[PDB]
């Protein structure tokens, strides 16, 4: 009831979620650069 106070994991959760999203992007980007997900089709 004192607003400005304690820990609200909501910000940190978004930070973790945002960071986690970035992690996934790096793995996808790295594999794409290997052409592993890239194939020559007709």
């Amino acid at each position: 009831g004192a607003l400005e106070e304690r820990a609200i994991p909501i910000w940190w959760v978004l930070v973790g979620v945002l960071g986690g999203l970035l992690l996934l992007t790096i793995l996808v980007l790295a594999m794409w650069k290997v052409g592993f997900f890239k194939r020559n089709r007709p």
Partner: protein
């Protein structure tokens, strides 16, 4: 006491981070399966 766990942020952040890693790994695995099926389906 004031913090039985208190910074559940560590636990939650770890849990949040862990859950995402599992999702990231799982999605990657599915993509692999799709290529494997297409690569396997050659014949």
């Amino acid at each position: 006491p004031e913090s039985p766990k208190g910074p559940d942020i560590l636990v939650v952040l770890l849990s949040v981070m862990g859950a995402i890693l599992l999702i990231g790994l799982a999605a990657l695995l599915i993509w692999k399966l799709l290529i494997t099926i297409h690569d396997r389906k050659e014949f």
